[model samples]
Target: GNGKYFSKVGSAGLKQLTNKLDINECATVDELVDEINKSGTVKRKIKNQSAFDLSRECLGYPEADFITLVNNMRFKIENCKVVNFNIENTNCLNNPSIETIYRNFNQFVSIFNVVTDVKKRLFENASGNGSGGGLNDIFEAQKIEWHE
Candidate 1:
């Protein structure tokens, strides 16, 4: 029950959403909102479309938050060992804090790796450095004849 969606996780939704909402072509927050709102799922989640904005989007999970956490990990990677070699290097108060940071780093390293990998995939797609073509072409449209 992870919070991420198939769309956000694997990005397969990108191709389907292309036909549904013209996603990649959207350049502004307004366009993205207008496009996303057309989806019943997205529309239900985001009721107050008038208040929707991109700044809050970035604010929720800013890359800077992860970047700073990486810096913290880097510091521990280079220093935690040397600190352990000498007990006097950090007193009781600081020792637990430093130890906890390293512990957190170990716990989250895999998660950070996954996040970075996902970012890479999305970046490649966004830059058009990866796949191309009209994705809708990939789906064979089914013709339905209605009886009167």
Candidate 2:
């Protein structure tokens, strides 16, 4: 029988069968162990795949729109301050205008900075250089000595 068939057995039955079985039946246990190990390893592989998908979604048009809006607000505030306006004209005079652009600018800029920092850390960690020693030094040594 296949390893999958053995895997379908109840825990108690599985334990009992394995206890009574000889070497040939032990082969089924080996196959079952290998299957279990493969599933465990794939969990991390799937996690990384999902992480990449999320990163792409976050870094694409959403961030682009954020940048565009920030620039538009900044330009409007600056132009509103410096553009010529008639003081004597009643309609133009005492019209409400924006004060400091720093308020909204700081908010968006900080958000952008945070995203950039996240990207930086992601790249650093993925490249195996976020922390000192270990694999980073091993690779460095290998590159210097073996030209790998």
Candidate 3:
């Protein structure tokens, strides 16, 4: 009876880890492995594209600014010092593993959210009418007009 009980607990623990780690449930072991490998590449590509677009659009903001934002957010999450999380760094062991991979993913999500919010605010801060009002206006005026 105890052996059967322990097996149930083990299965539950695995499910819990999967849920907590935000991993998708795969139909097969090979599919799960493929998911893990592909997720890393996908996220990296997203980060690269995001950085490129942000740099291209956001004039006067250096490439380092975008990188610094990502790095700072990563540092905060890794240290468990983010203001968003109330829990202390008790159970979080800074080991390199699947946990770290998902943690990195979470960091990207957080940073992207922040970037979206900030970009919106920045655009709003500039006058809504494209009437030559703000720094963005200057950049926009200098941008090549495709219609001509």
Candidate 4:
């Protein structure tokens, strides 16, 4: 190993660790979007929607800066707080399980201190004619690139 933490596992053990996480990834994306869409800001995107607006009952913001955020990102950050979520599913906690339902929410905490090397990499390498603008521009000129 490279002396780093890996949730899934190394290449040799990938078949065991990665398969379930891969399956979970599919619905996690859709389910996370469903949760963010409830923010209600998407329906009425006025005021300072640049940050967040959770006034509405549902979890979606209107189509402005937020609409882009909603469409592009499956999660919304409200004053640095993740919108909301249910944290369980049936199958994951079945068989000989202790928990009832299992849920996974989409959220990210931006750590100011220390190094944000990975997050910076994700933003700078995202696809688009991005032009290095907006909040996603988290990296320096050299560390950024495009992806599909």
Better of 1 and 4 by TM-score: 1
lDDT of 2: 0.28
Model 3 Cα lDDT, one tens digit per residue, 1-148: 1212112222232222223223465332233223323444322222234422322222223344433333333333322122232223423323333234334443333333333322333232434342112332223323257334
lDDT of 3: 0.31
Find the 10 residues in a row with the least total lDDT in model 2: 77-86
Clashing pairs in 2: none
Better of 2 and 4 by lDDT: 2
TM-score of each: 0.26, 0.22, 0.22, 0.16
Clashing residue pairs in candidate 1 (N, C-alpha, C atoms within 3 angstroms): none
- Across residues 24-139, which tens digit of lDDT does each residue of candidate 4 receive? 11122223223222322211121122222322101221324332333333443343334332323333333232121111112111110001111222222534233123442232
Candidates 1 and 2: which is better by TM-score?
A: 1
Give the best candidate by TM-score: 1
> What is the per-residue lDDT of model 2 for residues 1-148, given as tens digits with 9 covering 90 to 100?
3423322233322232222221012234333233222332222222243322222232232434333333344231121121111122223222222112222333222222222222333333545433222332222222245322
- Model 1 per-residue lDDT tens digits across residues 19-39: 333334332223333444344
Q: How far off is residue 49 in model 3, in Å?
A: 8.4
* Top-lDDT structure, candidate number: 3
* Model 1 C-alpha lDDT versus the unseen true structure: 0.30
Query: What is the full ranking by TM-score, best candidate first?
Result: 1, 3, 2, 4
